Design a protein around this motif. Structure first.
Motif, PDB file in Angstrom:
ATOM      1  N   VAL A 126      -1.348   1.704  -8.864  1.00 61.01           N
ATOM      2  CA  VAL A 126      -1.402   0.815  -7.686  1.00 61.01           C
ATOM      3  C   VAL A 126      -2.225  -0.442  -7.935  1.00 61.01           C
ATOM      4  CG1 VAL A 126      -2.460   0.546  -5.386  1.00 61.01           C
ATOM      5  CG2 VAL A 126      -0.920   2.439  -5.801  1.00 61.01           C
TER       6      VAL A 126
ATOM      7  N   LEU B 156      -8.467   6.126  -6.632  1.00 59.63           N
ATOM      8  CA  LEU B 156      -8.363   6.183  -5.173  1.00 59.63           C
ATOM      9  C   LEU B 156      -8.312   7.663  -4.770  1.00 59.63           C
ATOM     10  CD1 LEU B 156      -5.753   3.383  -4.604  1.00 59.63           C
ATOM     11  CD2 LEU B 156      -8.191   3.085  -4.304  1.00 59.63           C
TER      12      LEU B 156
ATOM     13  N   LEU C 152      -1.631   7.512 -10.856  1.00 54.69           N
ATOM     14  CA  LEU C 152      -0.878   6.623 -10.005  1.00 54.69           C
ATOM     15  C   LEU C 152      -1.731   5.660  -9.200  1.00 54.69           C
ATOM     16  CD1 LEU C 152       1.703   9.226  -8.573  1.00 54.69           C
ATOM     17  CD2 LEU C 152       1.989   7.665 -10.553  1.00 54.69           C
TER      18      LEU C 152
ATOM     19  N   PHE D 188      -3.653  -6.294  -7.972  1.00 51.35           N
ATOM     20  CA  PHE D 188      -4.716  -7.210  -8.313  1.00 51.35           C
ATOM     21  C   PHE D 188      -4.270  -8.449  -9.058  1.00 51.35           C
ATOM     22  CE2 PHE D 188      -7.810  -3.311  -8.773  1.00 51.35           C
ATOM     23  CZ  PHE D 188      -7.756  -3.091  -7.423  1.00 51.35           C
TER      24      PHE D 188
ATOM     25  N   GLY E  78      -6.277  -5.500   0.829  1.00 52.31           N
ATOM     26  CA  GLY E  78      -6.398  -4.609  -0.308  1.00 52.31           C
ATOM     27  C   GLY E  78      -5.065  -3.986  -0.712  1.00 52.31           C
ATOM     28  N   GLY E  79      -4.063  -4.012   0.100  1.00 50.49           N
ATOM     29  CA  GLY E  79      -2.644  -4.154  -0.167  1.00 50.49           C
ATOM     30  C   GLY E  79      -2.092  -4.313   1.255  1.00 50.49           C
ATOM     31  N   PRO E  80      -0.789  -4.329   1.467  1.00 51.99           N
ATOM     32  CA  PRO E  80      -0.220  -4.440   2.793  1.00 51.99           C
ATOM     33  C   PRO E  80      -0.398  -3.277   3.761  1.00 51.99           C
ATOM     34  CG  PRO E  80       1.524  -4.174   1.141  1.00 51.99           C
ATOM     35  CD  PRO E  80       0.215  -4.230   0.392  1.00 51.99           C
ATOM     36  N   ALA E  81      -0.498  -2.047   3.267  1.00 54.56           N
ATOM     37  CA  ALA E  81      -0.631  -0.882   4.147  1.00 54.56           C
ATOM     38  C   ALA E  81      -1.919  -0.960   4.934  1.00 54.56           C
ATOM     39  CB  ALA E  81      -0.546   0.423   3.353  1.00 54.56           C
TER      40      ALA E  81
ATOM     41  N   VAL F  76      -7.299   5.213   1.923  1.00 55.04           N
ATOM     42  CA  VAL F  76      -7.931   3.925   2.230  1.00 55.04           C
ATOM     43  C   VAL F  76      -7.360   3.265   3.478  1.00 55.04           C
ATOM     44  CG1 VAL F  76      -8.075   1.565   1.243  1.00 55.04           C
ATOM     45  CG2 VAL F  76      -8.864   3.581  -0.077  1.00 55.04           C
ATOM     46  N   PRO F  77      -6.035   3.097   3.546  1.00 53.33           N
ATOM     47  CA  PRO F  77      -5.399   2.540   4.745  1.00 53.33           C
ATOM     48  C   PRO F  77      -5.734   3.314   5.999  1.00 53.33           C
ATOM     49  CG  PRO F  77      -3.989   2.153   2.924  1.00 53.33           C
ATOM     50  CD  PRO F  77      -5.082   3.106   2.414  1.00 53.33           C
TER      51      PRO F  77
ATOM     52  N   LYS G 155       8.875   4.260  -9.983  1.00 51.39           N
ATOM     53  CA  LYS G 155       7.749   4.375  -9.071  1.00 51.39           C
ATOM     54  C   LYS G 155       7.056   3.013  -8.994  1.00 51.39           C
ATOM     55  CE  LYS G 155       4.959   8.352  -7.776  1.00 51.39           C
ATOM     56  NZ  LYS G 155       5.993   8.737  -6.792  1.00 51.39           N
TER      57      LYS G 155
ATOM     58  N   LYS H 263       7.203  -3.100  -2.573  1.00 53.11           N
ATOM     59  CA  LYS H 263       6.549  -2.869  -1.274  1.00 53.11           C
ATOM     60  C   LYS H 263       5.273  -3.647  -1.042  1.00 53.11           C
ATOM     61  CE  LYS H 263       7.603   1.322  -1.951  1.00 53.11           C
ATOM     62  NZ  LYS H 263       8.642   2.247  -2.498  1.00 53.11           N
ATOM     63  N   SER H 264       4.771  -4.227  -2.096  1.00 51.51           N
ATOM     64  CA  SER H 264       3.476  -4.882  -2.173  1.00 51.51           C
ATOM     65  C   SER H 264       3.388  -6.089  -1.283  1.00 51.51           C
ATOM     66  CB  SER H 264       3.159  -5.176  -3.652  1.00 51.51           C
ATOM     67  OG  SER H 264       3.781  -6.343  -4.134  1.00 51.51           O
TER      68      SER H 264
ATOM     69  N   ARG I  13       9.003   0.314  -7.034  1.00 56.39           N
ATOM     70  CA  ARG I  13       8.875   0.500  -5.600  1.00 56.39           C
ATOM     71  C   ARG I  13       7.512  -0.016  -5.107  1.00 56.39           C
ATOM     72  NH1 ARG I  13      11.785   5.133  -7.267  1.00 56.39           N
ATOM     73  NH2 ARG I  13       9.979   6.511  -7.397  1.00 56.39           N
ATOM     74  N   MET I  14       6.413   0.316  -5.726  1.00 54.78           N
ATOM     75  CA  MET I  14       5.124  -0.286  -5.411  1.00 54.78           C
ATOM     76  C   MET I  14       5.170  -1.839  -5.433  1.00 54.78           C
ATOM     77  SD  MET I  14       2.531   2.041  -7.678  1.00 54.78           S
ATOM     78  CE  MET I  14       2.064   3.707  -7.294  1.00 54.78           C
TER      79      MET I  14
HETATM   80  C1  LIG Z   1       1.078   0.548  -2.751  1.00 54.07           C
HETATM   81  C2  LIG Z   1       1.698  -0.073  -1.474  1.00 54.07           C
HETATM   82  C3  LIG Z   1       1.800  -1.592  -1.783  1.00 54.07           C
HETATM   83  C4  LIG Z   1       3.137   0.493  -1.278  1.00 54.07           C
HETATM   84  O1  LIG Z   1       3.577   0.083   0.012  1.00 54.07           O
HETATM   85  P1  LIG Z   1       4.088   1.203   0.858  1.00 54.07           P
HETATM   86  O2  LIG Z   1       4.462   0.570   2.150  1.00 54.07           O
HETATM   87  O3  LIG Z   1       2.994   2.135   1.166  1.00 54.07           O
HETATM   88  O4  LIG Z   1       5.350   1.908   0.146  1.00 54.07           O
HETATM   89  P2  LIG Z   1       5.757   3.401  -0.168  1.00 54.07           P
HETATM   90  O5  LIG Z   1       5.140   4.276   0.891  1.00 54.07           O
HETATM   91  O6  LIG Z   1       7.212   3.675  -0.213  1.00 54.07           O
HETATM   92  O7  LIG Z   1       5.059   3.845  -1.531  1.00 54.07           O
HETATM   93  C5  LIG Z   1       4.783   3.221  -2.767  1.00 54.07           C
HETATM   94  C6  LIG Z   1       4.292   4.120  -3.870  1.00 54.07           C
HETATM   95  O8  LIG Z   1       2.874   4.397  -3.787  1.00 54.07           O
HETATM   96  C7  LIG Z   1       2.491   5.541  -4.452  1.00 54.07           C
HETATM   97  N1  LIG Z   1       1.131   5.916  -4.105  1.00 54.07           N
HETATM   98  C8  LIG Z   1       0.201   5.239  -3.378  1.00 54.07           C
HETATM   99  N2  LIG Z   1      -0.961   5.904  -3.275  1.00 54.07           N
HETATM  100  C9  LIG Z   1      -0.776   7.084  -3.974  1.00 54.07           C
HETATM  101  C10 LIG Z   1      -1.599   8.209  -4.189  1.00 54.07           C
HETATM  102  N3  LIG Z   1      -2.854   8.343  -3.751  1.00 54.07           N
HETATM  103  N4  LIG Z   1      -1.051   9.231  -4.912  1.00 54.07           N
HETATM  104  C11 LIG Z   1       0.237   9.093  -5.378  1.00 54.07           C
HETATM  105  N5  LIG Z   1       1.061   8.102  -5.216  1.00 54.07           N
HETATM  106  C12 LIG Z   1       0.505   7.094  -4.499  1.00 54.07           C
HETATM  107  C13 LIG Z   1       3.581   6.513  -4.089  1.00 54.07           C
HETATM  108  O9  LIG Z   1       3.830   7.516  -5.070  1.00 54.07           O
HETATM  109  C14 LIG Z   1       4.780   5.597  -3.799  1.00 54.07           C
HETATM  110  O10 LIG Z   1       5.879   5.770  -4.758  1.00 54.07           O
HETATM  111  P3  LIG Z   1       7.249   6.456  -4.342  1.00 54.07           P
HETATM  112  O11 LIG Z   1       8.337   5.592  -3.932  1.00 54.07           O
HETATM  113  O12 LIG Z   1       7.545   7.423  -5.557  1.00 54.07           O
HETATM  114  O13 LIG Z   1       7.135   7.570  -3.418  1.00 54.07           O
HETATM  115  C15 LIG Z   1       0.915   0.505  -0.252  1.00 54.07           C
HETATM  116  O14 LIG Z   1       0.852   1.825  -0.515  1.00 54.07           O
HETATM  117  C16 LIG Z   1      -0.546  -0.010  -0.303  1.00 54.07           C
HETATM  118  O15 LIG Z   1      -0.764  -1.102   0.274  1.00 54.07           O
HETATM  119  N6  LIG Z   1      -1.368   0.806  -0.991  1.00 54.07           N
HETATM  120  C17 LIG Z   1      -2.763   0.207  -1.065  1.00 54.07           C
HETATM  121  C18 LIG Z   1      -3.868   1.018  -0.434  1.00 54.07           C
HETATM  122  C19 LIG Z   1      -5.152   0.800  -1.177  1.00 54.07           C
HETATM  123  O16 LIG Z   1      -5.986   1.696  -1.250  1.00 54.07           O
HETATM  124  N7  LIG Z   1      -5.488  -0.325  -1.792  1.00 54.07           N
HETATM  125  C20 LIG Z   1      -6.865  -0.227  -2.451  1.00 54.07           C
HETATM  126  C21 LIG Z   1      -7.075  -1.080  -3.694  1.00 54.07           C
HETATM  127  S1  LIG Z   1      -7.882  -0.189  -5.033  1.00 54.07           S
END
Ligand SMILES: CC(C)(COP(=O)(O)OP(=O)(O)OC[C@H]1O[C@@H](n2cnc3c(N)ncnc32)[C@H](O)[C@@H]1OP(=O)(O)O)[C@@H](O)C(=O)NCCC(=O)NCCS
Ligand SMILES: CC(C)(COP(=O)(O)OP(=O)(O)OC[C@H]1O[C@@H](n2cnc3c(N)ncnc32)[C@H](O)[C@@H]1OP(=O)(O)O)[C@@H](O)C(=O)NCCC(=O)NCCS
Lengths: 387, 387
Positions: free
Chosen positions: A208, A265, A204, A213, A303-306, A269-270, A53, A60-61, A56-57
């Motif tokens: 993230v 979280l 989780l 960070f 705050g991340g790429p999403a 957020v996104p 897990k 994807k970051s 992958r984060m």
């Molecule tokens: C984390 C991040 C880099 C991953 O990029 P992505 O394009 O979204 O990639 P993916 O969708 O395949 O997911 C990544 C992982 O995030 C996890 N995730 C993110 N938020 C989650 C939540 N609220 N609950 C559970 N899992 C969460 C997923 O479980 C996933 O793992 P997986 O492959 O088992 O399914 C992207 O989710 C992101 O930018 N998140 C940041 C949003 C945010 O709130 N930042 C605030 C800073 S505190």
């Protein structure tokens, strides 16, 4: 009498950014191999599912590396920091009460060098950090470290979170504009030593934060009425706002406990940012008669790429709008308050280096966004500077 | 264009205090019997010498009572809070993250009632506290509790210490003066639940804090360009300064640890304040042509009585100058940032009630001092208002 004092006391023009300088801890942490380092350093190698897990984060970051005060040698001397939740605030505090002002210092000395003026002309000092609190604070430590005058007017912004790159600007605007001659040193210094913690499969959201960070400081000198051909404007601040998105209670919460700073979280957020960004944009640029968001230059807390991708999709911004923001995400990760300041640096250097007509990528008007707890959105309206 | 926006955006007159309201926890703690209560509640009755020492501090304090969130019933459920140094930050934080905004709320609702205008006209919100930190912070909780607009511009000042009654004013001045129409709600809310701790005979400095500190909140509405006969000015802010006294490194330090907020006194605070106050005063009033410090009205953070007595002695102020300050010390103890705000309240009510010609005891020009960590001195120059 009081009106004559008021007229003589106040500046005339818009608060202007006149220097920017940044610093980062010397330890560079590759993101590619980070899940193997992090899961071994926290004795979590048995947690296979969780690790996968996390890989992958990290993949994807869209972060290639981050600079971190914490090293393996520091982490082997603080196992309580390596656990998900063990008593460890005194240890973290001892790291960041020192590291914050030391890193701040590095950044400010560069901005002060770029500015070129005597440091004794610094009349106001804003320090902003989300790591650690202390009394006297980091503002006092930095005043002392830099040799600033003892009467500099200090603004210590503690525990603000990820939007505070926009707060510091909002604050700096009103200090520079209301005080004739005032020159504001703004330092945003963020060390993640207060937030690092081991992984837990039922938290989780906390995981993230561990992928995204990173550390770093930025410093600005902000002033109105620049002395032409002595001081060199980079951006001008025109307007600001701060707002709390509806339906976002608990989206980004962070509590400073005996086990350090934890982040939670609880919403999307996104999707909250995307859903509300248009509103922010119309409140800012509708009085400017501008409605085409590909015609202004962008700065967005990554705050991340999403967040970035969902804002770009929402508005149909060309891919290139987020270039500077993403180049900073790539090279440093999300540095909390400092992050948007590195993005201004990154944008003005790139426009200058590439021969563009403004420091705002060739464009006149720009926007900077701060996103963070509340769910809070900070908006600053900028105008670029010719050449 | 930008200069036309800048001209239309800015206010015209001096920031004015237009309402003040205060609140305190309902538990009243008599000072006379406090050494018996405190030494029994902390299981320290065997420490005779220390107790005697504390009774002399309480008798010399010139404090008759203080209001305290902490009760015996709360203290019997938190023995770790009753010890000098036991892990207890999560317990303290849970008290003050709630109590700070709740008490703040009480104070602000009174000021807002006195002001009389729609709360939706509140454009800026400054929250100041030395007890607890949280994200989103107390500014966000108070925005929510009061029903303020979601776009109010927030200034969360955490862990500032005893001078921050002057900081909040310094900040409020520049927000009100630079923004046309802006109306600032200022809330200073201090709960000592974060600092209460048991006694230790090798940490007498910590024991002094236990005789002097008490709880309370104050709220102001600050604005420039009051609407005549709709809003009612109380004081006008003209000038401010902030400075760090020479030779005072470590005079008042306070660290937020796993065992709570601890305070340490490493120099002579009363003698540092006295020694430096003249300097502050000349920097403030020399451009006003005033040199007679019995001709202005006074407000001084009462960090205990010795500060006051040594300042009065130094300057030869008549005994009456410090009346309002001492009446607040007497009734509430030292409430950290809120303290000087209760003293403005106390002064304007007394002047109005007694038929004097200004809210500044009959006088035109006044000074307010904030003293605290650094060793920091905050100076605000005030002008009273007729009637
Ligand atoms: C984390 C991040 C880099 C991953 O990029 P992505 O394009 O979204 O990639 P993916 O969708 O395949 O997911 C990544 C992982 O995030 C996890 N995730 C993110 N938020 C989650 C939540 N609220 N609950 C559970 N899992 C969460 C997923 O479980 C996933 O793992 P997986 O492959 O088992 O399914 C992207 O989710 C992101 O930018 N998140 C940041 C949003 C945010 O709130 N930042 C605030 C800073 S505190
Ligand atoms: C505490 C205070 C109320 C007592 O009033 P006072 O007029 O000074 O009375 P006294 O001089 O008789 O002394 C009171 C006790 O303070 C103690 N004390 C104060 N500062 C001390 C220090 N740095 N080290 C040791 N003892 C100290 C003394 O031991 C004394 O006890 P005693 O009778 O055994 O000798 C007065 O000292 C005061 O206002 N102190 C506050 C100064 C300050 O820094 N406040 C900052 C807030 S953190």
């Amino acid at each position: 009498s009081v009106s004559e004092i008021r007229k003589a006391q106040r500046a005339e023009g818009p608060a202007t950014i006149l220097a920017i300088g940044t610093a980062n801890p010397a330890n560079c942490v590759e993101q590619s191999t980070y899940p193997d380092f992090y899961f071994k350093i926290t004795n979590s190698e048995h947690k296979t599912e969780l690790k996968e897990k996390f890989q992958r984060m990290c993949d994807k970051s869209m972060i290639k590396r981050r600079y971190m005060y914490l090293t393996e040698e520091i982490l082997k001397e603080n196992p309580n920091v390596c656990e998900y939740m063990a008593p460890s605030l005194d240890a973290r505090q001892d790291m960041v009460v020192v590291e914050v002002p030391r890193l701040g210092k590095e950044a400010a000395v560069k901005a002060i060098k770029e500015w070129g003026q005597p440091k004794s002309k610094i009349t106001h000092l804003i320090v902003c950090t989300t790591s650690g609190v202390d009394m006297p604070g980091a503002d006092y430590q930095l005043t002392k470290l830099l040799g600033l005058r003892p009467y500099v007017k200090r603004y210590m912004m503690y525990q603000q979170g990820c939007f505070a790159g926009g707060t510091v600007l909002r604050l700096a605007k009103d200090l520079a504009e209301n005080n004739k001659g005032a020159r504001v040193l703004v330092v945003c210094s963020e060390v993640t030593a207060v937030t690092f913690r081991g992984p837990s499969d039922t938290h989780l959201d906390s995981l993230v934060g561990q992928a995204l960070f990173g550390d770093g400081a930025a410093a600005l000198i902000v002033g109105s009425d620049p002395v032409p051909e002595i001081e060199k404007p980079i951006f001008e601040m025109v307007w600001t706002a701060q707002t709390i998105a509806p339906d976002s209670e608990g989206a980004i919460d962070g509590h400073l406990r005996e086990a350090g700073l934890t982040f939670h979280l609880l919403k999307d957020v996104p999707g909250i940012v995307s859903k509300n960004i248009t509103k922010a944009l119309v409140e800012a640029f509708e009085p400017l008669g501008i409605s085409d968001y590909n015609s202004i230059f962008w700065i967005a807390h990554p705050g991340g790429p999403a967040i970035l991708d969902q804002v770009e999709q929402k508005l149909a911004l060309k891919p290139e709008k987020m270039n500077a923001t993403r180049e900073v995400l790539s090279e440093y990760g999300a540095m909390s308050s400092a992050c948007v300041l590195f993005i201004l640096d990154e944008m003005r250097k790139k426009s200058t280096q590439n021969g563009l007509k403004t420091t705002g990528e060739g464009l006149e008007w720009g926007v900077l966004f701060g996103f963070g707890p509340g769910l809070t959105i900070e908006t600053v309206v900028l105008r670029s500077v010719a050449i």
